[PDB]
Amino acid sequence: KNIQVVVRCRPFNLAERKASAHSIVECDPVRKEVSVRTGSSRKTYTFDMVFGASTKQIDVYRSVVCPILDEVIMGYNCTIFAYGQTGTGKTFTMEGERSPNEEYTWEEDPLAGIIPRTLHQIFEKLTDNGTEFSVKVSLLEIYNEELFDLLNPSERLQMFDDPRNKRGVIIKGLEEITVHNKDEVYQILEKGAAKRTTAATLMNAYSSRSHSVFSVTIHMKETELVKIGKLNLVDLAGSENNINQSLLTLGRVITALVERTPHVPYRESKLTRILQDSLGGRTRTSIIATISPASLNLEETLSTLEYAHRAKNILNKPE
């Protein structure tokens, strides 16, 4: 199956209003098109889905992620990437935010993004639909070609080949935490958030240059036939950017794949080793390309759109 590629455009922000920018992006969800005025000259792209600035978190989840979670629960591996310019909505999309003033429970918060909703829906979907299951999660960051375990309450992780799968790696020392119930989900996410703000203190431009890999693995057993599904939820460093080796190598890998070049340089960065199987392997993969509507960003926005559109022709073969 081909990589699914969707675009999410966010509303104008006030920094763009202060820069005197005008709108140059038109999202057409019905036609699945994004049009960019390139000076009345225009460039249109077609994607698998297009989400405009009024799209709600829950819309993204139902339209993009629900199909993918169903595949995981069938026992496949899946990956969703968020790709795009700093400030355009990668983290808002993958993680979301809490609404102000303690107004919602985490499970009901309309600003939750893909990660919290996915973990909540795992428990809704598998609970007492006949199923015995366990769920574990891990969260690592990649910064400056170094691995950081956001769930380790203490360091630096070591990468080993997976002798069982050539397109795979094993991260020794990664905290893979069992999530026993919905209430545990929020405690674990809270714990990763605290670990990331202190990650913020000891880093240079850390969040915009770091990659974040959240992984959930579901062990499922029914009578006695077993299923193991994995989902990786990846928030990439900003696309405008050892500090950039992984982002740059991701660009070479995608290029190598789109040109059918026989040498794909997967092993030239930690990110591309981790998601080697997501890029031309046996994992089903979607990319959410995030963009700004503002004229200020024409060059980054065109770069993001070209990058993402080319990705549509990469074929994966799940299982």
Ligand X SMILES: CC(=O)/N=C1/NN(C(C)=O)[C@](C)(c2ccccc2)S1
User: Binding site membership: which residues?
Assistant: 84-91
Question: Which listed option, Mg ion, ligand X, ligand ADP, none, makes contact with residue 112 (CB within 5 to 8 Å by class)?
Answer: ligand X
Answer for which of 85, 91, 272, 278 binds Mg ion (CB under 5 A) is 91
Binding site residues for ATP, as ranges?
A: 84-91
Choose among 139, 134, 132, 88: nearest CA to 115: 139
CB nearer to ligand ADP: pick between 27 and 185: 27
Q: Which is nearer to ligand X, 66 or 74 (CB)?
A: 66
In angstroms, the CA 290 to CA 125 distance is 29
Q: Which of 91, 215, 286, 292 binds ligand ADP (CB under 6 A)?
A: 91
Q: Which of these ranges, 62-70, 88-96, 189-197, 217-225, lies near ligand ADP under the rule CB under 6 A?
A: 88-96
Helix, strand, coil abundance in the chain, percent, nearest 5:
35, 30, 35
| Site map 220..259 versus ligand ADP, x via CB under 6 A | ------------------x---------------------
Does 87 contact ligand ADP by CB under 6 A? yes
- Nearest 5°: the CA angle 298, 19, 92 is 65
Q: How far is the CB of 9 from ligand ADP (least distance, A)?
A: 8
Residues in 94-133 at the binding interface with ligand ADP, rule: CB under 6 A = 97
Give the residue from 25, 90, 50, 40 showing the smallest Cα distance to 302: 25
92 binds, among ligand ADP, Mg ion, ligand X, none (CB under 5 to 8 A by kind): ligand ADP
- Cα separation, 208 vs 239, whole angstroms: 9
Nearer CB in complex with ligand X: 233/291: 233
CB atoms inside a 10 Å sphere around CB 171: 20
Which CB atom, from 61 or from 92, has the smaller least distance to ligand ADP? Answer: 92
- Residue 161's alpha-carbon distances to 158, 174, 217, 256, in angstroms, are 10, 15, 19, 22
Q: How far is the CB of 113 from ligand X (least distance, A)?
A: 6
Interface segment toward ligand ADP; rule CB under 6 A; list 41-49, 82-90, 166-174, 276-284: 82-90
Say if CB 35 and CB 25 are below 8 A apart. yes
- What is the DSSP secondary structure assignment for residue 66, as one 8-state letter? H
How many Cα atoms within 13 Å fall on the side-chain side of residue 268? 14
Inter-residue contact 214 to 233 (CB < 8 Å): yes
Between residues 105 and 223, which has the closer beta carbon with respect to ligand X?
105
- Contacts to ligand X by CB under 6 A: 95-98, 106, 109, 112, 115-116, 139, 189-190, 192-193, 214
Phi, psi (5° rounding) for residue 29? Answer: -60, -35
**Residue with tokens 């400030």, as numbered in its chain:** 87
Handedness of CA 300, 267, 149, 282 (dihedral sign): positive
Q: Does 90 bind ligand ADP (CB under 6 A)?
A: yes
Binding segment toward Mg ion, per CB under 5 A, in 12-20, 88-96, 125-133, 255-263: 88-96
Binds 249: which of Mg ion, ligand X, ligand ADP, none (CB < 5-8 Å by kind): none
Stretch that binds Mg ion, among 70-78, 85-93, 224-232, 239-247 (CB under 5 A): 85-93
Distances from the Cα of 152 to the Cαs of 137, 149, 181, in angstroms? Answer: 12, 6, 20
Site for ligand ADP, rule CB under 6 A: 10-11, 13, 84, 86-92, 97, 238, 290
